[PDB]
Amino acid sequence: SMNKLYIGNLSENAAPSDLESIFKDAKIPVSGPFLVKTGYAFVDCPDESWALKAIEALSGKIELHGKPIEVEHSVPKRQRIRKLQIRNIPPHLQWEVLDSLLVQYGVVESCEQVNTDSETAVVNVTYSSKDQARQALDKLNGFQLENFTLKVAYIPDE
Amino acid sequence: SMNKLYIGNLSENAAPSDLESIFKDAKIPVSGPFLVKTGYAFVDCPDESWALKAIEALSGKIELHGKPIEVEHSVPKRQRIRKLQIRNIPPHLQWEVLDSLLVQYGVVESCEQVNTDSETAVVNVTYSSKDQARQALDKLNGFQLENFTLKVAYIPDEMA
Protein backbone atom coordinates (compact mmCIF):
# COMPACT_ATOMS: atom_id res chain seq x y z
CA SER A 1 0.00 0.00 0.00
CA MET A 2 3.09 2.18 0.30
CA ASN A 3 3.20 2.32 -3.51
CA LYS A 4 0.49 4.97 -4.01
CA LEU A 5 1.36 8.65 -4.30
CA TYR A 6 -0.60 11.77 -3.53
CA ILE A 7 0.42 14.81 -5.56
CA GLY A 8 -0.67 18.13 -4.05
CA ASN A 9 -0.53 21.89 -4.53
CA LEU A 10 -1.56 21.58 -8.19
CA SER A 11 -3.11 24.46 -10.06
CA GLU A 12 -6.56 23.97 -11.54
CA ASN A 13 -5.16 23.55 -15.07
CA ALA A 14 -2.68 20.79 -14.18
CA ALA A 15 -3.10 17.94 -16.67
CA PRO A 16 -1.96 14.29 -16.58
CA SER A 17 0.61 15.13 -19.26
CA ASP A 18 2.21 17.70 -16.92
CA LEU A 19 2.69 15.02 -14.24
CA GLU A 20 3.84 12.40 -16.77
CA SER A 21 6.68 14.68 -17.89
CA ILE A 22 7.64 15.50 -14.31
CA PHE A 23 7.94 11.81 -13.47
CA LYS A 24 9.68 11.06 -16.78
CA ASP A 25 12.15 13.92 -16.17
CA ALA A 26 12.91 12.43 -12.76
CA LYS A 27 13.05 8.93 -14.34
CA ILE A 28 10.36 7.55 -11.99
CA PRO A 29 8.19 4.75 -13.44
CA VAL A 30 4.51 4.64 -12.64
CA SER A 31 2.40 1.50 -12.75
CA GLY A 32 -0.91 3.22 -13.49
CA PRO A 33 -2.40 6.44 -14.82
CA PHE A 34 -2.30 9.84 -13.18
CA LEU A 35 -5.75 10.46 -11.71
CA VAL A 36 -6.08 14.25 -11.57
CA LYS A 37 -8.69 16.03 -9.47
CA THR A 38 -8.86 19.75 -8.64
CA GLY A 39 -5.67 20.86 -6.90
CA TYR A 40 -4.31 17.33 -6.39
CA ALA A 41 -3.80 13.96 -8.04
CA PHE A 42 -2.93 10.30 -7.47
CA VAL A 43 -0.53 7.92 -9.19
CA ASP A 44 0.87 4.51 -8.25
CA CYS A 45 4.48 3.43 -8.50
CA PRO A 46 5.60 -0.15 -9.16
CA ASP A 47 6.83 -0.53 -5.56
CA GLU A 48 7.51 1.45 -2.39
CA SER A 49 11.14 2.11 -3.31
CA TRP A 50 10.12 3.93 -6.50
CA ALA A 51 7.37 5.83 -4.69
CA LEU A 52 9.80 6.92 -1.97
CA LYS A 53 12.22 7.95 -4.70
CA ALA A 54 9.45 10.07 -6.23
CA ILE A 55 8.74 11.74 -2.88
CA GLU A 56 12.41 12.46 -2.23
CA ALA A 57 13.04 13.69 -5.77
CA LEU A 58 9.92 15.80 -6.28
CA SER A 59 8.10 16.98 -3.16
CA GLY A 60 8.83 20.66 -2.66
CA LYS A 61 11.51 20.70 -5.35
CA ILE A 62 9.69 20.72 -8.71
CA GLU A 63 7.42 23.60 -9.65
CA LEU A 64 4.47 23.28 -12.00
CA HIS A 65 2.66 26.48 -13.03
CA GLY A 66 4.72 28.43 -10.54
CA LYS A 67 3.78 26.20 -7.57
CA PRO A 68 6.10 23.71 -5.79
CA ILE A 69 4.35 20.33 -6.11
CA GLU A 70 3.78 18.14 -3.07
CA VAL A 71 4.41 14.41 -3.51
CA GLU A 72 3.47 12.33 -0.46
CA HIS A 73 2.39 8.81 0.39
CA SER A 74 -1.34 8.64 -0.29
CA VAL A 75 -3.02 7.99 3.04
CA PRO A 76 -6.82 7.91 3.46
CA LYS A 77 -7.92 9.86 6.50
CA ARG A 78 -9.09 6.73 8.31
CA GLN A 79 -5.54 5.30 8.04
CA ARG A 80 -3.80 8.33 9.56
CA ILE A 81 -3.46 6.87 13.04
CA ARG A 82 -0.13 5.95 14.69
CA LYS A 83 2.38 5.54 11.84
CA LEU A 84 4.63 8.25 10.39
CA GLN A 85 7.56 8.47 8.02
CA ILE A 86 10.42 10.87 8.70
CA ARG A 87 12.53 12.07 5.77
CA ASN A 88 15.53 14.38 5.39
CA ILE A 89 17.21 12.96 8.52
CA PRO A 90 20.86 14.19 8.58
CA PRO A 91 23.07 11.52 7.04
CA HIS A 92 25.02 10.24 10.06
CA LEU A 93 22.64 11.27 12.83
CA GLN A 94 23.15 9.23 15.97
CA TRP A 95 20.00 7.21 16.66
CA GLU A 96 20.32 8.34 20.29
CA VAL A 97 19.55 11.87 19.10
CA LEU A 98 16.53 10.86 17.00
CA ASP A 99 15.18 8.77 19.90
CA SER A 100 15.53 11.77 22.22
CA LEU A 101 13.27 13.74 19.88
CA LEU A 102 10.78 10.95 19.21
CA VAL A 103 10.10 10.07 22.85
CA GLN A 104 9.14 13.63 23.74
CA TYR A 105 5.79 12.90 22.03
CA GLY A 106 5.01 9.36 23.14
CA VAL A 107 6.18 5.79 23.39
CA VAL A 108 7.73 4.61 20.15
CA GLU A 109 5.96 1.31 19.51
CA SER A 110 7.99 0.68 16.36
CA CYS A 111 10.84 2.37 14.51
CA GLU A 112 12.48 1.06 11.34
CA GLN A 113 15.12 2.60 9.10
CA VAL A 114 14.10 2.58 5.42
CA ASN A 115 16.84 1.87 2.90
CA THR A 116 17.57 4.71 0.48
CA ASP A 117 20.41 5.92 -1.73
CA SER A 118 19.82 9.60 -0.96
CA GLU A 119 22.27 11.52 1.23
CA THR A 120 19.72 11.58 4.07
CA ALA A 121 17.97 8.90 6.10
CA VAL A 122 14.32 7.82 6.34
CA VAL A 123 12.59 6.01 9.19
CA ASN A 124 9.07 4.76 9.81
CA VAL A 125 7.71 5.32 13.30
CA THR A 126 4.72 3.75 15.01
CA TYR A 127 3.73 5.68 18.11
CA SER A 128 1.69 3.98 20.80
CA SER A 129 -1.44 6.01 20.05
CA LYS A 130 -3.15 8.27 17.54
CA ASP A 131 -2.70 11.36 19.72
CA GLN A 132 1.05 10.76 20.08
CA ALA A 133 1.68 10.47 16.34
CA ARG A 134 -0.39 13.59 15.74
CA GLN A 135 1.61 15.67 18.23
CA ALA A 136 4.88 14.26 16.88
CA LEU A 137 3.84 15.19 13.33
CA ASP A 138 2.92 18.73 14.38
CA LYS A 139 6.22 19.18 16.28
CA LEU A 140 8.70 17.30 14.04
CA ASN A 141 7.44 18.22 10.56
CA GLY A 142 9.59 21.18 9.61
CA PHE A 143 11.92 20.87 12.62
CA GLN A 144 15.39 22.10 11.75
CA LEU A 145 18.21 19.75 12.74
CA GLU A 146 21.82 20.49 11.71
CA ASN A 147 20.71 22.59 8.70
CA PHE A 148 18.36 19.80 7.60
CA THR A 149 14.59 20.28 7.77
CA LEU A 150 12.81 17.11 8.89
CA LYS A 151 9.89 16.10 6.69
CA VAL A 152 7.26 14.15 8.62
CA ALA A 153 4.07 12.75 7.12
CA TYR A 154 1.52 10.01 7.75
CA ILE A 155 1.84 6.53 6.32
CA PRO A 156 -1.04 4.01 6.19
CA ASP A 157 -1.92 2.54 9.56
CA GLU A 158 -3.37 -0.94 8.77
CA SER B 1 -16.90 -14.36 -30.92
CA MET B 2 -17.44 -12.82 -27.49
CA ASN B 3 -19.46 -15.69 -26.04
CA LYS B 4 -16.48 -18.04 -25.77
CA LEU B 5 -15.01 -18.34 -22.28
CA TYR B 6 -11.60 -19.29 -20.98
CA ILE B 7 -11.65 -20.87 -17.51
CA GLY B 8 -8.30 -20.85 -15.70
CA ASN B 9 -6.67 -21.81 -12.40
CA LEU B 10 -8.38 -25.21 -12.44
CA SER B 11 -7.07 -28.11 -10.42
CA GLU B 12 -5.80 -31.11 -12.34
CA ASN B 13 -8.74 -33.10 -10.94
CA ALA B 14 -11.42 -30.81 -12.39
CA ALA B 15 -14.04 -32.59 -14.50
CA PRO B 16 -16.77 -31.10 -16.71
CA SER B 17 -19.34 -32.00 -14.05
CA ASP B 18 -17.56 -29.64 -11.67
CA LEU B 19 -18.04 -26.79 -14.11
CA GLU B 20 -21.62 -27.74 -15.04
CA SER B 21 -22.70 -27.50 -11.39
CA ILE B 22 -20.85 -24.18 -11.02
CA PHE B 23 -22.61 -22.57 -14.00
CA LYS B 24 -25.90 -24.21 -12.98
CA ASP B 25 -25.77 -22.72 -9.48
CA ALA B 26 -24.86 -19.31 -10.87
CA LYS B 27 -27.82 -19.67 -13.28
CA ILE B 28 -25.62 -19.22 -16.38
CA PRO B 29 -26.53 -21.33 -19.44
CA VAL B 30 -23.95 -22.73 -21.82
CA SER B 31 -24.43 -23.37 -25.53
CA GLY B 32 -22.01 -26.32 -25.68
CA PRO B 33 -19.87 -28.70 -23.65
CA PHE B 34 -17.01 -27.87 -21.33
CA LEU B 35 -13.64 -28.83 -22.84
CA VAL B 36 -11.28 -29.49 -19.92
CA LYS B 37 -7.55 -29.30 -20.68
CA THR B 38 -4.82 -29.21 -17.92
CA GLY B 39 -5.54 -26.46 -15.41
CA TYR B 40 -7.94 -24.62 -17.73
CA ALA B 41 -11.10 -25.16 -19.77
CA PHE B 42 -13.16 -23.69 -22.62
CA VAL B 43 -16.94 -23.30 -22.91
CA ASP B 44 -19.44 -21.24 -24.91
CA CYS B 45 -22.33 -19.18 -23.61
CA PRO B 46 -25.40 -18.55 -25.79
CA ASP B 47 -24.46 -14.89 -26.43
CA GLU B 48 -22.08 -12.11 -25.39
CA SER B 49 -24.19 -11.01 -22.45
CA TRP B 50 -24.27 -14.44 -20.81
CA ALA B 51 -20.50 -14.66 -21.34
CA LEU B 52 -20.02 -11.30 -19.57
CA LYS B 53 -22.31 -12.38 -16.72
CA ALA B 54 -20.21 -15.52 -16.33
CA ILE B 55 -17.07 -13.41 -15.99
CA GLU B 56 -18.59 -11.06 -13.41
CA ALA B 57 -20.45 -13.70 -11.39
CA LEU B 58 -17.75 -16.38 -11.42
CA SER B 59 -14.20 -15.07 -11.91
CA GLY B 60 -12.27 -15.04 -8.62
CA LYS B 61 -15.52 -15.63 -6.69
CA ILE B 62 -15.93 -19.42 -6.93
CA GLU B 63 -13.45 -22.00 -5.71
CA LEU B 64 -13.15 -25.49 -7.13
CA HIS B 65 -11.11 -28.08 -5.22
CA GLY B 66 -9.67 -25.23 -3.15
CA LYS B 67 -8.55 -22.86 -5.89
CA PRO B 68 -10.58 -19.89 -7.10
CA ILE B 69 -11.47 -20.31 -10.74
CA GLU B 70 -10.76 -17.56 -13.28
CA VAL B 71 -13.21 -16.74 -16.08
CA GLU B 72 -12.45 -14.47 -19.01
CA HIS B 73 -13.20 -13.92 -22.66
CA SER B 74 -11.35 -16.49 -24.74
CA VAL B 75 -9.11 -14.46 -27.04
CA PRO B 76 -6.38 -16.16 -29.11
CA LYS B 77 -3.09 -14.31 -28.84
CA ARG B 78 -3.13 -13.21 -32.49
CA GLN B 79 -6.52 -11.57 -31.84
CA ARG B 80 -5.29 -9.53 -28.84
CA ILE B 81 -4.63 -6.26 -30.65
CA ARG B 82 -6.49 -2.92 -30.27
CA LYS B 83 -9.62 -3.85 -28.31
CA LEU B 84 -10.11 -3.99 -24.54
CA GLN B 85 -13.03 -4.48 -22.19
CA ILE B 86 -13.04 -2.51 -18.92
CA ARG B 87 -15.18 -3.82 -16.07
CA ASN B 88 -15.98 -2.74 -12.52
CA ILE B 89 -16.14 0.97 -13.42
CA PRO B 90 -17.68 2.92 -10.48
CA PRO B 91 -21.38 3.51 -11.27
CA HIS B 92 -21.45 7.31 -11.42
CA LEU B 93 -18.03 8.01 -12.92
CA GLN B 94 -18.00 11.04 -15.18
CA TRP B 95 -16.99 9.75 -18.60
CA GLU B 96 -14.45 12.58 -18.75
CA VAL B 97 -12.64 11.00 -15.79
CA LEU B 98 -12.39 7.64 -17.53
CA ASP B 99 -11.38 9.37 -20.77
CA SER B 100 -8.57 11.28 -19.05
CA LEU B 101 -7.19 7.88 -18.06
CA LEU B 102 -7.70 6.22 -21.44
CA VAL B 103 -5.92 8.89 -23.45
CA GLN B 104 -2.73 8.61 -21.42
CA TYR B 105 -2.04 5.44 -23.41
CA GLY B 106 -3.05 6.30 -26.97
CA VAL B 107 -5.83 7.41 -29.27
CA VAL B 108 -9.27 5.97 -28.51
CA GLU B 109 -10.80 5.17 -31.90
CA SER B 110 -14.02 4.07 -30.23
CA CYS B 111 -15.64 3.50 -26.84
CA GLU B 112 -18.92 1.64 -26.34
CA GLN B 113 -20.91 1.09 -23.19
CA VAL B 114 -21.96 -2.51 -22.63
CA ASN B 115 -25.27 -3.41 -21.06
CA THR B 116 -24.85 -5.15 -17.74
CA ASP B 117 -27.04 -6.08 -14.79
CA SER B 118 -24.15 -5.02 -12.55
CA GLU B 119 -24.18 -1.69 -10.76
CA THR B 120 -20.71 -1.10 -12.18
CA ALA B 121 -20.24 -0.05 -15.78
CA VAL B 122 -18.51 -1.91 -18.62
CA VAL B 123 -17.03 -0.40 -21.78
CA ASN B 124 -15.36 -1.85 -24.85
CA VAL B 125 -12.48 0.37 -26.01
CA THR B 126 -10.61 0.29 -29.32
CA TYR B 127 -7.20 2.00 -29.37
CA SER B 128 -5.48 2.99 -32.60
CA SER B 129 -2.77 0.36 -32.33
CA LYS B 130 -1.73 -2.82 -30.53
CA ASP B 131 1.03 -1.21 -28.44
CA GLN B 132 -1.40 1.39 -27.05
CA ALA B 133 -3.91 -1.27 -25.98
CA ARG B 134 -1.15 -3.41 -24.50
CA GLN B 135 0.09 -0.42 -22.51
CA ALA B 136 -3.44 0.53 -21.45
CA LEU B 137 -4.17 -3.01 -20.27
CA ASP B 138 -0.97 -3.22 -18.23
CA LYS B 139 -1.55 0.18 -16.60
CA LEU B 140 -5.34 0.06 -16.11
CA ASN B 141 -5.83 -3.53 -14.94
CA GLY B 142 -5.99 -3.38 -11.15
CA PHE B 143 -6.15 0.42 -11.14
CA GLN B 144 -8.15 1.67 -8.17
CA LEU B 145 -10.66 4.45 -8.79
CA GLU B 146 -13.14 5.66 -6.16
CA ASN B 147 -12.73 2.39 -4.21
CA PHE B 148 -13.28 0.18 -7.30
CA THR B 149 -10.58 -1.97 -8.87
CA LEU B 150 -10.78 -1.71 -12.65
CA LYS B 151 -10.66 -5.00 -14.54
CA VAL B 152 -9.24 -4.76 -18.06
CA ALA B 153 -8.89 -7.69 -20.47
CA TYR B 154 -8.59 -8.16 -24.21
CA ILE B 155 -11.50 -8.87 -26.50
CA PRO B 156 -11.09 -10.31 -30.00
CA ASP B 157 -9.76 -7.84 -32.54
CA GLU B 158 -10.55 -10.18 -35.40
CA MET B 159 -10.48 -7.58 -38.18
CA ALA B 160 -6.99 -6.23 -37.40
Curated annotation (Swiss-Prot), chain A:
**RRM domain segment(s):** 3-76, 82-157
Also noted in the record is: Autoantibodies against IGF2BP3 are detected in sera from some patients with a variety of carcinomas.
Q: In which tissues is it expressed?
A: Expressed in fetal liver, fetal lung, fetal kidney, fetal thymus, fetal placenta, fetal follicles of ovary and gonocytes of testis, growing oocytes, spermatogonia and semen (at protein level). Expressed in cervix adenocarcinoma, in testicular, pancreatic and renal-cell carcinomas (at protein level). Expressed ubiquitously during fetal development at 8 and 14 weeks of gestation. Expressed in ovary, testis, brain, placenta, pancreatic cancer tissues and pancreatic cancer cell lines.
Chain coiled-coil ranges: none
Q: What is the lineage of its organism?
A: Eukaryota, Metazoa, Chordata, Craniata, Vertebrata
The name of this protein is Insulin-like growth factor 2 mRNA-binding protein 3
Which family does the record assign? Belongs to the RRM IMP/VICKZ family.
Subcellular localization: Nucleus; Cytoplasm; Cytoplasm, P-body; Cytoplasm, Stress granule
Q: Indicate the quaternary assembly.
A: Can form homooligomers and heterooligomers with IGF2BP1 and IGF2BP3 in an RNA-dependent manner. Interacts with IGF2BP1. Interacts with ELAVL1, DHX9, HNRNPU, MATR3 and PABPC1.
- Write the span of the intact protein that is present: 1 to 157 of 579
Gene name, per UniProt, is: IGF2BP3
Q: What does this protein do?
A: RNA-binding factor that may recruit target transcripts to cytoplasmic protein-RNA complexes (mRNPs). This transcript 'caging' into mRNPs allows mRNA transport and transient storage. It also modulates the rate and location at which target transcripts encounter the translational apparatus and shields them from endonuclease attacks or microRNA-mediated degradation. Preferentially binds to N6-methyladenosine (m6A)-containing mRNAs and increases their stability. Binds to the 3'-UTR of CD44 mRNA and stabilizes it, hence promotes cell adhesion and invadopodia formation in cancer cells.
For this UniProt entry, which residues form the secretion signal?
none
Its domain description in UniProt is: All KH domains contribute to binding to target mRNA. Domains KH3 and KH4 are the major RNA-binding modules, although KH1 and KH2 also contribute. The KH domains are also required for RNA-dependent homo- and heterooligomerization. The integrity of KH domains seems not to be required for localization to stress granules.
